[PDB]
Symmetry: C3
Subunit: 392 residues, 3 copies
C-alpha cells in the first residue's frame, strides 16, 4: 500500500556494475560504474574517462561476482567507452529508452558506485535537456538531473521510472568535488549509436555535413532578421560536401533535425556527430523567413580519433583508424620522437594482419593484443610491398 | 502512464526568467532569476540583492528572447525588488498561491538559473515554515526547502505541484557556497503585498503597531506564568500608537494575527512589516491567562528607506521617500560630505517635478530618470519657494 | 487534491526533539536530535556521540517546551544512547517499523535539527542496505539514504511514508561537512534491542557465538570452492562456545540468520552484537556445498563496555559492568594513575549500594548519581568484607 521504486529496481540493479581499473601513463587506480548493454556478449558501457589508459579492468556485479573485462572501443570526443566482460555468464542487460521523448518534468533514478561504497541508488528529476559547454571540443547533449551523483557514479545508469535507460551519468557541476544538485548524463540515443559502431568496428566512423556554424542567439537573429531565438546558424558550407550538394546556403538557420526541433548548434553537432557515415537524414531549414526541407547523406570526414596509444597502451606515435570496408587498420600520421615511429612506424602503412591473424579493423587488432603476446608481429603494407614490424 | 512534473512545468516555465546585471559602486557583473508577475506590463519580481546597484539590467526568457528592463521599486529590508521589461510582448505571468495555506509535508519545485546554466528545475519539499534570523534587521518569514538551490537561483520561483507560486528563492545555508539541502524563499503573500505597493508608488509605505517585543521562549513564559511556549511578547507599547489606542498593554502575548496563529515575533514583524499603512487588522491577545481580541489600524512610521542613491544610482546623500498623497518626493535627511548635498540638496526639500514632468512619487521620478537625460533639472520647494537643482 | 507528506508529519513531528548539551573533558556545547520512544516514561533515543561526556542535557519539543533529561544508557560500539526526560508530561512517542522489511526503492523522510535551525524535514529514498566500514570496530548495519542530513540531524528520525521509524540518522559521507547525497541511519530493529536492554539494566549485556570470521569475497570463494559471493566465512570456532557446541566448523559459510539472508560478516556481527545473552537463534550454514541448519544460544562474553567514566563523568579508571542477576555493579579492571583507583577503587569490587540506596545494576547506580549528592558513599564488597568508598 506504499509507493516504492523497489519493485522496478529489483529487476534493474543487476544491469549496473562497478568497475575497478589499474593503469599508468606512474601507477594509478580508479573506479566508476558501468551498464550491461548485451547480456550474452558481456558488453558493458561506461565513460571513456574512467577506463582510459587502463592496464587492467575488473567488473563487479551487484551479486558479488567479479570478472575481467577488456576494451573494445572508446570515444574521447563523446566520452563513451565500450568494454567486454571476459567469460560472461548469467548476466542481465538493461533495455534502453528513447531519450528523445524525455521531458523536463520527468522523474529519474541514478544507479552507480559513489566512492566505491557499492551499488547506490539516488533519485531526482530531469532539470534540463541539451546542456553543453562543459568541454567545448566534445560532442555534448547532456540531460541534467538533481538525483545525487558523486565520484564513482561515472559510467552508471540514469533510468526512468520503468527502469529503462535514458542516460549514462558523466559529470557534475560542483566546487569542492561534492554534489550540489547539478549532474549530467549522456542521453541514451547517443549511447545506442556510438556503442553499436564500436561493437562492429572498434571505433566510430564519424560523418559530416560540412557546414560551419554557431549558436543562433537573439542578437545575431536581429542582425539577420530571423524569427527564431535559437538554432544553428550556417556561417558557410564546404564545397563538395553533403550540405553543398543538398542546397544549403550560408546564412541559413537549421531549426530541426529529422522532425526533432533543434535546441542549438551544439546539440546538432552532437546528434550527427554520432550518426555513422552514409546515414540518410533530413534538415529543417529557415532561409529568408521561409521554411525549407532538405534531404542529406552523411559523408566522410577527417575525424581525429584512435591514436596508436589507445590500442597499444603507451606506444605514442601516429594516429590510426579503420580503412574502407574491412580492409585493415590504417596509420594516419606519424609524429617524430614518438615511440611508434621508433619501431619503424610510418604513416600510410596498412596493418593487414598480426601474429598470423587477419586484421580487418581496430576490433580484430585489439583482439590479438588481448591475448597479450610477448612479441607482436605486424604484417603491414607500405606501397606495393608487404613488410613486418616487430614489438615486445 | 508515468507520473511527471512535465505537464505542469510546460505551462509554468515561460513565467520564469534569467537576469543579467552590469553595475558599479569598480565594475561588476551579476546574474540571477526573476518571475513574471504581470504579462501585460512586463512586471518581473526578483531579489533586491541581485539587481541592487545595477547600471544595466537585461532579462532573458526561456525561449531565448532578451529584453532590457528598468527598475521600478526595491525593498532592502525584505530583499524584494520589482523591475519592468521595456517593451513587453507575448509574455506569460505566474498565478500566485496563498502561502498561508502551506504545510511542511508539501511538495515544492524550484525554477531558476544556477551558475547561468539556463532555466533549471529542481524539486523537494517544504522543510519548515517561518524561518528567520538569517539577517536580524530584515523582515524574514522564510519557507525552507530541500529542492536544490544554488547561486543564480535568486529571484526565481518556488512553486507547488499546481504550478502556483508560493515563494521567491532567496538564500541558502551552505558552507562553501554549494547547496546542502537547506534553502529559503520569501513566502508569496509577502511578495504580493510588497510588490503591489511598489507598482503604485515606487516604494513601500511601512506601517507600524508601535510595540516593542521579543520572542516568547519557554523560560520567559515561566517568568511570566503564561501557557504558551511561542509568540510575541509585548515588552511595551508606544504612546499615541495604534497599539496604545487599541488597548494593548505591556506584558501581553500576541498569539494570532487575523485568525492566523503566530509562529513568533519575527513572523509578526514580517507580516505587518509588509502591510500598507491604513490596513485594518485584528490581533489575538493573551493577557493574564485570558484570551483577548483587538482591532487595529496600521499607522505611520519612521521607516528608513530609499536613499538618494537607490534613485540616482551613485549620488550618496539624503534619504528620500514619498509624501502624503501623490505630493512628490520628500528629502528625509541630508548628510554632509555626501555628493547629493554637494548639488544643493537640503533636507526638507520636496521634489515636485523634473525636466518639465510632474513628480507625484518615486515611481514617476525614476521614470524621468529612465529616459537618461544629460542634465536633470529638479523642480523643488524649499519653504515657500520654488527652486531648481541641476545635475549631469 | 495534491499529494503531500503533511498529513503524516503532523502526527509524527511531535515525536522528534532537539537536544542541547553542555559538557567537558575544557568546556563544550553540542546539539543534535532525538526520538521519543516511550511517551509515559519520557524515554528518548539518540546517538551516543551527541550526548557523550555531557554535564547537562536539555531537550526541546517541537511545540517549544524545554525539559531536562538525564542519561540512562549508552553504547559507544553501536553509537546509541538512551536518555530520559525529567518530569515528562503530554508527550508523543513514535511507533517503530520493522527495519528488516526495508527495500532499496523505498521512500524515506528524515526529521531533525540541522545547525540548530529547528525541526527540519527532508526526504529521499533508501539508497542501500547493510552499509558498514565507517568505523570498523563498531557494529554497523546502516541504512543509506539521500534525504538531506547535516550536522544537528544526529539522533533524529528516519521514517517511512506511514510515519513509522525505520532508523536513527547517524552519519554522512561528506568532504567539507556539507551533505552530498549520502547519509546513514542505524536500522530500527537494532535500536529496538539496544534500547530495551538499557532501559532494564543501564547497559547492554553482549552475547557471542564465539567464531572468528571475515567477509566472504569472490576470490576467497574460489579458493574455497563455494557457490556464494557473499556471507560470513568461519575462520575458526572457539572451544566451549555456543558455536562449538552447536556443531559449526571452521571453513563454514554463514548465509542466513533466522531466515534472513546475510549481507555480510559485519551485518552478522551487528545483528547478534545487539541481541541479549540467552537469545535463541538459528543459523543458515553452508559446509562443503551442502546447506546446514543450526540452533544456537547466545552466550556470555568479555565485552569492553561502560568505563567508570561513563557513570562518574570524569572519573577515569577501572571499567565497570553489571553482575549476574541484579547483583550490583562489578568493577572490571582498574588502571594505575587513573583517578578512580585514586579513591581506593580496586578491580573485583562489587558496588552493592550507594548513599543508603541499593544498587542492583548500572541504572540504579546512575539514579543515585542523578540526585547529585555532595558526597557519594559507595557500599562495596571486597572479598568477604563490606567496605565504604567516599567521593565528592
Amino acid at each position: 500500500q506504499m509507493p516504492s521504486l523497489a519493485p522496478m529496481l529489483e529487476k534493474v540493479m543487476p544491469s549496473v556494475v562497478s568497475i575497478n581499473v589499474e593503469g599508468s601513463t606512474q601507477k594509478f587506480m580508479a573506479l566508476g560504474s558501468g551498464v550491461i548493454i548485451d547480456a550474452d556478449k558481456g558488453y558493458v558501457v561506461t565513460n571513456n574517462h574512467v577506463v582510459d589508459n587502463a592496464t587492467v579492468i575488473k567488473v563487479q556485479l551487484s551479486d558479488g561476482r567479479k570478472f575481467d573485462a577488456k576494451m573494445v572501443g572508446k570515444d574521447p570526443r563523446s566520452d563513451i567507452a565500450l568494454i567486454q566482460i571476459q567469460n560472461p555468464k548469467n548476466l542481465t542487460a538493461i533495455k534502453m529508452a528513447d531519450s528523445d521523448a524525455l521531458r523536463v518534468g520527468d522523474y529519474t533514478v541514478a544507479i552507480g558506485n559513489p566512492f566505491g561504497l557499492g551499488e547506490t541508488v539516488t533519485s531526482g528529476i530531469v532539470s534540463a535537456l541539451g546542456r553543453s559547454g562543459l568541454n567545448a571540443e566534445n560532442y555534448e547533449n547532456f540531460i541534467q538531473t538533481d538525483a545525487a551523483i558523486n565520484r564513482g557514479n561515472a559510467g552508471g545508469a540514469l533510468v526512468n521510472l520503468n527502469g529503462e535507460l535514458i542516460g549514462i551519468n558523466t559529470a557534475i557541476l560542483a566546487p569542492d568535488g561534492g554534489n550540489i544538485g547539478i549532474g549530467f548524463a549522456i542521453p541514451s540515443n547517443m549511447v545506442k549509436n556510438l556503442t553499436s559502431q564500436m561493437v562492429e568496428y572498434g571505433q566510430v566512423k564519424r560523418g559530416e555535413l560540412g557546414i560551419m556554424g554557431t549558436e543562433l542567439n537573439s542578437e545575431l537573429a536581429k542582425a539577420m532578421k530571423v524569427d527564431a531565438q535559437r538554432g544553428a546558424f550556417v556561417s558557410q558550407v564546404l564545397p563538395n560536401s553533403s550540405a553543398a550538394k543538398a542546397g544549403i546556403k550560408a546564412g541559413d538557420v537549421i531549426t530541426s533535425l529529422n522532425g526533432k526541433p533543434i535546441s542549438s548548434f551544439a546539440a546538432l553537432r552532437a546528434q550527427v556527430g554520432t550518426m555513422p557515415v552514409g546515414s540518410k537524414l533530413t534538415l529543417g531549414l529557415l532561409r529568408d523567413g521561409k521554411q525549407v526541407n532538405v534531404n542529406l547523406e552523411l559523408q566522410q570526414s577527417s575525424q581525429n580519433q584512435v591514436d596508436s596509444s589507445s590500442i597499444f597502451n603507451g606506444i605514442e606515435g601516429a594516429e590510426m583508424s579503420n580503412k574502407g570496408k574491412d580492409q585493415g587498420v590504417v596509420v594516419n600520421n606519424v609524429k617524430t620522437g614518438t615511440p611508434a615511429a621508433q619501431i619503424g612506424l610510418k604513416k600510410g602503412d596498412v596493418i593487414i594482419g598480426a601474429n598470423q591473424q587477419a586484421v580487418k579493423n581496430i576490433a580484430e587488432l585489439r583482439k590479438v593484443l588481448d591475448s597479450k603476446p610477448s612479441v607482436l608481429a605486424l604484417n603491414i603494407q607500405r606501397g606495393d610491398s608487404t613488410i613486418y614490424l616487430l614489438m615486445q
